[PDB]
Amino acid sequence: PARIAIDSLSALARGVSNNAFRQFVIGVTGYAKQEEITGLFTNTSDQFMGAHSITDSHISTITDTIILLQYVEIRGEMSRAINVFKMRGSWHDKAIREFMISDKGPDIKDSFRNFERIISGSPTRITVDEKSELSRIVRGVQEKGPES
Amino acid sequence: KLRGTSHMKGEYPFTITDHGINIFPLGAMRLTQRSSNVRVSSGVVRLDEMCGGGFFKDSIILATGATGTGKTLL
Amino acid sequence: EHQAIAKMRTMIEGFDDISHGGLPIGRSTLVSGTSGTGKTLFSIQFLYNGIIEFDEPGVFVTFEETPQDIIKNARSFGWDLAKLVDEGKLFILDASPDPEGQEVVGGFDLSALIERINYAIQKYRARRVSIDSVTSVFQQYDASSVVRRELFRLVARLKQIGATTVMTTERIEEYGPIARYGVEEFVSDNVVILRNVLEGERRRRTLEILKLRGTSHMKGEYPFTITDHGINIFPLGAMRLTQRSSNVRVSSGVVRLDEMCGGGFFKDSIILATGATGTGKTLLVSRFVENACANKERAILFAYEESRAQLLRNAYSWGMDFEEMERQNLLKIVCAYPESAGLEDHLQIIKSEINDFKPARIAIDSLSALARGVSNNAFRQFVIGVTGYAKQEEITGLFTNTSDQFMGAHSITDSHISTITDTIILLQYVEIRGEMSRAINVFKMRGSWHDKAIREFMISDKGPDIKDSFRNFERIISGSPTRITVDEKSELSRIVRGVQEKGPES
Amino acid sequence: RGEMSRAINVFKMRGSWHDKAIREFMISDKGPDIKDSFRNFERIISGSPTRITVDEKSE
Ligand SMILES: Nc1ncnc2c1ncn2[C@@H]1O[C@H](COP(=O)(O)OP(=O)(O)OP(=O)(O)O)[C@@H](O)[C@H]1O
Ligand SMILES: Nc1ncnc2c1ncn2[C@@H]1O[C@H](COP(=O)(O)OP(=O)(O)OP(=O)(O)O)[C@@H](O)[C@H]1O
Ligand SMILES: Nc1ncnc2c1ncn2[C@@H]1O[C@H](COP(=O)(O)OP(=O)(O)OP(=O)(O)O)[C@@H](O)[C@H]1O
Ligand SMILES: [Mg+2]
Ligand SMILES: [Mg+2]
């Protein structure tokens, strides 16, 4: 193969000890690496929303690029977000983009610019006067320019 | 032990297959993997953009998220 | 030296510190351990170093190995015993049995042996004696009391003769009785235990001086390694807190940082960079290593997370050409999986390479990676070891730590190395407007003033650009702050309308 | 509001599309009645919401 994907390293960690597991990861990881095979590995975090570490098993240092998916509760609704957490040789986007899933597949929309605490799964929506300043009613300093 | 010379120490896992004993010296693998600047697509264009032009051919990519978030889609 | 007992140096690396001078002269030291622990090697090294450094002839008594084998095997460490046997400095006295023999002979032989060994000692004018595996001799058909008497007889005659002896013994359990018959322990003047402990599929060798009638010594277990140079022991608790301390500064390879650190790092200092995965600890390391080359100084980058190739691709993408540093013979890259060894080994490889390359700067990318698996106490011990070596050697050291949780990390380190370190550089993700920005912070610095700001910074091909602090924010460390505004729009250059040019002209 | 209400959510479904709303629901003798989402609330998931009651754009 040119590419390899393992759907759920996190399912292989079931039972086994962390040290035996880490050993397995380095195993399939370095084999792929020395073989010029691009590999995409999957990890299901044990808790939805609020996850404080990329991986529970602490593999995220043994990896080059990290793609992170997370639920964001927006208005009584469960939406997704995707973020290129890190990429070793490149620049990658720093946005936590919202994204939907359809028959067409994944559509990556925009970031939740007007929110705080997104990482947490339950943001705090927050415009309460958007970036045009409490001077939307622009004072009336402009009461001169126009005349008769 | 091997009186007179050196050797790797410790336990090493192995499997008995149709080709007999197969041992993996997981601690004998060297940190000499080749590294290029060549890119490759994710299967998602917008993703590719976010990653500055695609995943590196020489790379380990990890997709994490809660159950149902769509790792399996990616 | 205030010790009541005259000792003889073994010249085995680290042993004389542990034993507060070497083996008591005129007495015998039991050295016991399981199979493959290094007994035979210790006793050989004892005679060998004795001949090559003090011109003290030696008598080696072998009950199982063959004189050819003892000579063949010593070549592993580059020792030519054959030459010394030749010059009459070393005499191997073959006491092994015959592949063709009978049955019965372990006590008048114990007299035949005494009389024999006295001949050899007398003839070669020997001062050191090693008896290899006395155990195997009564392993003919004996019970505890018979062993205690025979041993005692031998040790005793040897003391009369005036010889300093090393007697080797076997044990079956790593932590059980000291030696087989549970009797040798008390019959010898000094006891040394060689252990080769399992624990998690890795093996760790330790040496312990359990007793030395008459003098003091270091207590407990000490990790050691058998190399091409024989036994090598690290008395990590024998390391003194007398490292030289200067006020001299050095660059980090990042100017803005240097400012932040009130004029760059101290030459004499241990620096720590921690932050979640992806924050850029590796970038800073790269830039700290490169800086010692641009100043024509030698530096070593010990990498435990990235290949030498990858390290290079990535480095080049950040400017800095690692290729050149290599050729110019200013930069040396190591690289190794933490699993490809035990901490002891690792520690020695690092020391080793610092001696062959005499760096002025050293960088360990990810101590936190070396902590994978190992127990915290074994890890802390490793850190004090590499840290302290560097310190007493005037070598500036930059160590990396990846924190297990991005954002919201409540302690600088999960392993609590935070007191062992002089300067702490802290990297973190800040969620600002649906986006992950980074922030850098000089958390502490021992002899300087350093900036207290948590500056935001970007990473480009040019490398790290350190911008400004997030003044109008609260809950920064939390990782996802709250923006509050007494201002923001306040000056800095308001004067609206047409303030820019575009690409054409300006 | 000082009361313990319920909510239901189709957290995930592998082949389908399912609704992503966290819908309030009651239980009677008739069984389960699924009403509407808590659109004007924050931290629902946490169990202890905060209704937004935004002073709109406030003109
Ligand atoms: N045809 C579809 N149309 C819209 N959404 C879909 C469709 N199929 C699946 N989905 C959505 O995508 C999710 C499936 O996730 P996916 O199979 O990608 O793997 P995962 O989340 O990484 O891991 P796991 O399924 O084990 O939890 C569902 O929970 C659902 O919300
Ligand atoms: N050059 C070398 N480099 C590293 N290790 C070596 C080298 N030569 C030998 N060794 C190691 O040292 C060990 C030698 O043990 P040694 O012969 O000293 O006696 P022993 O283990 O105490 O007793 P026994 O006679 O039961 O084997 C070998 O097991 C091997 O692992
Ligand atoms: N050329 C580049 N241009 C812009 N950003 C880059 C470039 N190269 C790397 N980066 C950024 O720097 C990050 C790499 O982190 P770095 O190699 O410094 O080590 P780390 O964060 O300390 O440790 P680790 O990589 O093991 O997690 C990437 O995730 C990315 O955001
Ligand atoms: Mg799945
Ligand atoms: Mg790194």
UniProtKB/Swiss-Prot annotation, chain B:
Changes seen on gene knockout: Not essential for growth on low light, loss of circadian cycle and rhythmicity. Loss of rhythmic chromosome compaction. No visible phenotype during growth in a light/dark regime for 5-7 days (at 150 umol photons/m(2)/s). Accumulates much larger amounts of primary metabolites (especially those in and connected to the oxidative pentose phosphate pathway) in 4 hours after dark-light transition. Glycogen accumulates 4-5 hours earlier than normal, overall levels are higher, no change in glycogen degradation kinetics.
Residues reported to bind ATP 1: K1, L2, R3, T5, H7, T17, D18
Binding sites annotated in the UniProt record for ATP 2: T67, G68, T69, G70, K71, T72, L73
Post-translational modifications: Phosphorylated and dephosphorylated on serine/threonine residues by autocatalysis. Unphosphorylated, mono- and di-phosphorylated forms exist. The phosphorylated form correlates with clock speed. The presence of KaiA increases phosphorylation and stabilizes these forms. Phosphorylated on serine and threonine residues by autocatalysis.
Mutagenesis or variant effect for P25L: In kaiC6; induces a low amplitude phenotype and decreases the interaction with KaiA
Triggers of expression: Transcribed in a circadian rhythm with maximal expression at 12 hours and minimal expression 12 hours later; expressed as a kaiB-kaiC opperon, this gene does not have its own promoter. Autorepresses expression. Negatively regulated by labA. Non-phosphorylatable kaiC mutants still down-regulate the kaiBC operon.
Start and end residues of each stretch annotated as Linker: 25-37
Binding site for Mg(2+) 2: T72
Top-rank taxon: Bacteria
Role summary: The KaiABC oscillator complex constitutes the main circadian regulator in cyanobacteria. Complex composition changes during the circadian cycle to control KaiC phosphorylation; KaiA stimulates KaiC autophosphorylation, while KaiB sequesters KaiA, leading to KaiC autodephosphorylation. The Kai complex controls chromosome condensation, leading to a transcription accessible chromosome during the first half of the circadian cycle and a compact, less transcription-accessible chromosome during the latter half. Clock output pathways impact the RpaA transcriptional regulator.
Subunit organization: Homohexamer resembling 2 stacked donuts with a central pore nearly blocked on one side; hexamerization is dependent on ATP-binding. Binds 12 ATP; 6 between each subunit in both layers. KaiB only binds to phospho-Ser-431 KaiC (not doubly phosphorylated KaiC). Complex formation between KaiB and KaiC is regulated by the phosphorylation state of KaiC and by an ATP hydrolysis-driven conformation change in the CI ring of KaiC; complex formation is slow. Slow complex formation is crucial for the timing of the circadian period.
UniProt remark on domains: In the homohexamer the 2 domains (called CI and CII, joined by a linker) self-associate to each form a 'donut' layer; the compactness and local conformation of the domains varies over the cell cycle and impacts function. CII has the autokinase and autophosphatase activities, both CI and CII have (weak) ATPase activity; CI has the clock pacemaker role. The CI ring undergoes structural changes driven by ATP hydrolysis that together with the KaiC phosphorylation state regulate KaiB binding.
Further remarks about this protein from its record: 'Kai' means 'cycle' in Japanese.
Family: Belongs to the KaiC family.
Name by which UniProt lists this protein: Circadian clock oscillator protein KaiC
Source organism per UniProt: Synechococcus elongatus (strain ATCC 33912 / PCC 7942 / FACHB-805)
Residue range from the parent sequence: 224 to 297 of 519
